[PDB]
Amino acid sequence: RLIYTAGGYFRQSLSYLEAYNPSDGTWLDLADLQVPRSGLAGCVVGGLLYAVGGRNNSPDGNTDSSALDCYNPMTNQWSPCAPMSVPRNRIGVGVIDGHIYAVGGSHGCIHHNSVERYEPERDEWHLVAPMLTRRIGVGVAVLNRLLYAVGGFDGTNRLNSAECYYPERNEWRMITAMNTIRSGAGVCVLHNCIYAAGGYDGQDQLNSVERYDVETETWTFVAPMKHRRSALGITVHQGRIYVLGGYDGHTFLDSVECYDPDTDTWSEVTRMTSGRSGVGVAVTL
Amino acid sequence: GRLIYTAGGYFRQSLSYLEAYNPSDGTWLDLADLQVPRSGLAGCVVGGLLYAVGGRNNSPDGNTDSSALDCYNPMTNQWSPCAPMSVPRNRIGVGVIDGHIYAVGGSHGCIHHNSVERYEPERDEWHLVAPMLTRRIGVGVAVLNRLLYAVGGFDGTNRLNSAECYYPERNEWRMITAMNTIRSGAGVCVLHNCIYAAGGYDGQDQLNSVERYDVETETWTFVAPMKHRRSALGITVHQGRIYVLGGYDGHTFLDSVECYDPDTDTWSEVTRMTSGRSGVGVAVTLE
C-alpha cells in the first residue's frame, strides 16, 4: 500500500525513514534510524520493515554494517536484531517463504560472493552457498520461488551477467546475461518479468531499462527513464514500478519516476523530501 | 589435417614470425615471415591457404592498428595482400562459415568494435553484417552448427564472461548463457560439438581454468585446467585434441604448447615454440 525509504547518502550517510503514499501523493515522516547508513537494502516480512547491511560514511570515518535493524510500523521503534556473519555494503536482498536472503555486498576491500539467509522466527543468520560471481551493488529479484542475482561489481569489472539460485537444491546457475552492464541498478519483479533499471556501466550512469522474461529467457529493452541514476531505490506497487533517488555522477536525485507497463512510459510522480542516493526501499504489502 | 601454423605475436615488440608445427613428428618449419609484424591478429585456413587478419604493429617508433588481410600460400611460401577490412581490428576474433571469413570485434585506437564483417575469397570483398549486442576485444570465436559464437572479451571498461550467438541466415545476434569465469583474451575453439574456453584474463589474474559449452543443455562446465596460466593464447584442434600455443602469464611470454586429450581429461606439454610470445594468430591445415 505505502512505499518506505530508509537511509541513503547526501554529503553523509542518512538516518531518514520516510513513507510515500501513492494513493494521495504524501510523505509520512517516521522514526529515524538507529545508525545512519547508505548502501543498505529494505524488505518487508510479517509486516516488519527490515534494514539490512549498508555503510556509515561519516566525517569521522567509514564503517560497513553487518547490522539488521527492524521497524514495526505500529510501535514506531527501531529494534536491533541479530547481525549478519559479515558486513555488507552495497547489498541486495530477496525473500522466499519469509526468509531474508542477504546477497553479496562489500566489507571494505572484501567483495562478497557469499549469501546468507535470515529466519525471523529464530533470529538467526545461516549461510546458503556462494554465488558464481562476487557482486557488490547487486540487484536481487525473486520469481517463481527462485532467487536471481543481477549485475553488480566484482571489484574490477562491472557486470551484465545474472545467475539464478534454487532453494530446494541449494545451488546457483548462470542464466542469460543482460544487454547492458549494470552495477547499482534497481532490480524488481513485475508480471513474471525481472526488470533492471538504471545503474552504472563503468563510465556512465544509465537511464536505460530492460526486462527478463522467464519463458523466453531473453532480455528486452523497454522505455528508458527520464533521468539517469545509479544506487536507486526500487519497488512495485499495484502493477507499476517506482524508482526513488540515486546518483547521476555529480549530485543526488530527489526525483521519483513511475513506470506503466501498459503504455510503456515513465512519469515523475513525486519528489522526495531531499535528494539522496543508496537508499533501501520496500512496499508495505 | 597436417600443419599447425602460428603467425605474428609479441615479445618486446610485435613479431612477424610464421612457423608451422607438425604434430606427427614434432618438427618446426621456419616459413616466410609476415610483411608487417603484428600482435592480436587472428589466423584461419580457407581452401588450402592461411589467412592473417587484423592485429596491431606495436613498435618502438609507434603503434598502428591493422585492417589488413594477408593470405599465405604453402606451395609458394609467399604472403599475398587481400582487400582490407572496413576498420582496423586489433585483438580480433575470427571464424569460418561456408568458406567466408568473419571478422569479429577488436579495437581501433580508443574505439572498441561491436561491428562484424564477412570476407568472400572468391570476390575479394568485405561486407558488414549485423553487429554484436556487446563491444568485444580479445574475443573468442567458435563456429558450431553453422552458427558463429562470440565468447568473452573486453568492452573498453569491463572484462566479459558474457557470450552471444550469430545466425547467418537470419542475420541476427542472440545472447546465450554466460561463462562461469570472466575471460578476456582466452583461447576459444570447438572440439566434437562443444565450445571450449581456455585461459584468458579476468581483470586481475591470468587464468589456467578451462570450461566448455554444451549447446543443447545450454550450460558451461569446467574441465581439467591447463598446467600454465595464459592469456592472449593461440588455439586450434588437430585429430580430436586441442592445442594451445604461447600466451602471456602476467610477466613472461610462454613458448609452452599444451595438448588436451578429451577422453582422459588431461593436459600435457607436447612441445615448445622456438621463442616465447603472446597474441599469435593460430590455425591448422584442414581435414
Next chain:
Amino acid sequence: RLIYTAGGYFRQSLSYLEAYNPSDGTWLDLADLQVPRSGLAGCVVGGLLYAVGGRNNSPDGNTDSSALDCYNPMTNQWSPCAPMSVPRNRIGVGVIDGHIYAVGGSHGCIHHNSVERYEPERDEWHLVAPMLTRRIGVGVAVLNRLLYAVGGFDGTNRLNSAECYYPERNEWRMITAMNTIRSGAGVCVLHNCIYAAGGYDGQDQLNSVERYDVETETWTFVAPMKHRRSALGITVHQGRIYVLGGYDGHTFLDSVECYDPDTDTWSEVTRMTSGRSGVGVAVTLE
C-alpha cells in the same frame, strides 16, 4: 574591436596569435602562445583574451592541454592562469556573468561530459553539473544567460543532439536535435538564435548552416557556406558571423567567410596569413 585567432593546426600544432580588424581588413601579428595548441577555444572576459584547453601535437609526445592562458592586449603578453581539473582537447567554452565555462573535450580516449567554471577574480576552477552527453568537438553558445552545448562526438556516435545548461539551477536539459550530425562545427549566437555552421557528419565535411529558434524549438537551414569546413573558428562581430579556417578532408583553409543575416548570403572577406584548422576565436566585446 578585433577578431582574435589563437593556435590551430597545420602539419603540427600552431602557436600563432593574430587579430583581424574587420573595418579596414588588416591583420595584426600579436605575441604567440607560449605553448603551441590545436583544438583550443578562445573567449574574452574583462578586456582579456583567454586560451583554454586543446592539444599540442609535436609529434611526439602528443599532450592534451589543461592549461588556461590569459593574453593582455595592453601589454601584448601571455600569462599562465590556474589549470583546469582535466585536459580538454577539442573543447567548447562560453561566458556567463564574467565566468568561463569549460565544456566537454577529450583527454586521450576519455571523452568528457564534465563541465567546470573559472572565476577570473579568484583564479580558480570549480566543477559544475556535467552534460547529459559526452561531447568532444562541441560548439558552445550563450543566449538569455543559458549555455548551449551543440553537436560533437561522444566516443562512439557523431552527434546531431544538443542540450541547454541552467546556471542558477545547475542542471542540463536536452533540446531539439539538429537536422544534420555535426562534430567540429562553428557554433555562435546572432539575433537571439543559435547558429551551427559547418562540421563533420561522419562522411563529409559540411558547408551547410542551420539555426535554432529557442521559442519555436526548431532548427532551420540558412544559406550554406561557400567552402566546406570542420574544426573552424567562429565569432559574431557587429551583426555578422565570421568563420575562420578549418579542415575539409584534403586542405587546411585560410578562407574567412562572412554571413549577413539580412540578405542571407555568405561572402569571403579575407584570408588568414596561413591555412589552418582547430583555432580558438573570440572578439573584443561590445
